[PDB]
Amino acid sequence: SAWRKAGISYAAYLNVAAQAIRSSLKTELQTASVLNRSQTDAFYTQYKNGTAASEPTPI
Template sequence: MSAWRQAGLNYVNYSQIAAKLVRQALKPELRVQAAKRDESHVKFTTWKDGKPITEKL
């Protein structure tokens, strides 16, 4: 059994922790670039009868 499994982590949690530690170990100029890649955006679309429902803001 792997060490991360024995610690009670799943692979996703383990990889997130490892990625965070690697980013912290980078030089400052490279850390900024790595932080930009860490961002993610999610867009949700509600569907009804096979068509997306658009809401006007």
């Protein structure tokens, strides 16, 4: 269950718990503020030294 071994950064270690918690509550007391708070549509792309780039992927 190592997180800093083959898991993710400490920022992600607390992240998984943030969504798990926010999703472990009542569905009635779950404002839309929390919904979009766990939603993201950002993609990252690695570039080279010659303006080159890698295949786009989801964060």
